[PDB]
């Protein structure tokens, strides 16, 4: 698809640890991740404004660990990620900024590429802009209308196309939310529960009819533009198929976004479950809200880099907390990450060190146990403190620890 970014070198660490076990948002429990020879991952990409904030970084670094752990286990990986380059919040920001929405989106997607490369994040194999996926959205809305899962609303001026929330009997399995909770979150996260003519308040926009002052594309259901959830449903389905191991993204995507994107794909395919695991993570700003320029809580990766922060310290700072805990950035967090990075660099610069077999095995076990980076970091702290306090006589373990931290954590010592 679009140009993404360059991968760093990935060293190969001899040996293997346990297979990855991951919490599944849908079943609300840790379950084994069991891919075929090619493991498949779709992670919802950015809406291209506000650069790469630390919420972005926390999300895509978490899936970088999965990517890296799959490669460590010998899997081939198919990583697909989108860009929501046409989007109502994007239009709003562009109008507020006095800039064209495509100039804004192109510029911010480029800043994302640069931050992802600086953070040494492994790139997706297919990087797909929403505007380049219109045809696949159209093909799949055609299928949804043919089966009756979708309908055109009775509105001559604005004949929007909607997906029936009861098109699948299992609608709601991924979030587990009841109707009242869905109504609240649907309204506050882009849905239109009060739109006249819908069969159910929870019916989701599939194709928004042409409006004055809005970009539009041709289609057999009239000129318009895609709904948000069917964009990612169609990209994931057409690129990966039904054998999706992981659907991932930020915390707020549990509902409505991933609930409907799964329901759209299960309805067209007849399959019971779109993805085997649903994985959510992110990070709030200082005020407990998602990071946004208009809140004055926005911390950008490029800001940290301009202040002289090592990108590996950003990774370590984000990894100091578990991805399903409420992570928060602060000066204290940055300071411990800087001190941890310097400590690790000291030990891996030693002429000789104690055997690294146990700590590498322990790091692999902790990462395999629902990405327990706090305990993996603590195990490395312990090996480093033993090497620096008491020493050892393996001339290879300093480099071997550095290469493992590189391959598995993306941290460059
Ligand atoms: C609760 O804290 C959070 C909340 C949200 C996020 C986050 C992560 C990645 C991308 C985006 S996003 O807003 O840029 N884009 C989209 O959600 C769509 N393009 C998906 S298709 C937000 C992080 N931390
Ligand atoms: Ca290996
Ligand atoms: Ca010696
Ligand atoms: Zn998405």
Swiss-Prot record:
Enzymatic reactions: 1D-myo-inositol 2-amino-2-deoxy-alpha-D-glucopyranoside + L-cysteine + ATP = 1D-myo-inositol 2-(L-cysteinylamino)-2-deoxy-alpha-D-glucopyranoside + AMP + diphosphate + H(+)
GO cellular component: cytosol
UniProt-recorded Gene Ontology molecular function terms: ATP binding; cysteine-glucosaminylinositol ligase activity; cysteine-tRNA ligase activity; zinc ion binding
Cofactor annotation: Zn(2+)
UniProt binding sites for L-cysteinyl-5'-AMP: 44-47, 59, 82-84, 228, 250-252, 284
Gene Ontology process terms (BP): cysteinyl-tRNA aminoacylation; mycothiol biosynthetic process
Renumbered ranges of motif 'HIGH' region: 46-56
Family matches, as Pfam families: tRNA-synt_1e (PF01406)
Annotated keywords: ATP-binding, Ligase, Metal-binding, Nucleotide-binding, Zinc
Gene3D superfamilies: Anticodon-binding domain of a subclass of class I aminoacyl-tRNA synthetases, HUPs
Effect of substituting residue 47 to V: 100-fold decrease in catalytic turnover
Motif, 'ERGGDP' region: chain positions: 188-193
Short sequence motif named 'KMSKS' region, residue ranges: 290-294
EC number: 6.3.1.13
Transmembrane residue ranges: none
The record's free-text note on cofactor binding: Binds 1 zinc ion per subunit.
NCBIfam families membership: mycothiol_MshC (TIGR03447)
Function comment: Catalyzes the ATP-dependent condensation of GlcN-Ins and L-cysteine to form L-Cys-GlcN-Ins.
Family: Belongs to the class-I aminoacyl-tRNA synthetase family. MshC subfamily.
Protein name, per record: L-cysteine:1D-myo-inositol 2-amino-2-deoxy-alpha-D-glucopyranoside ligase
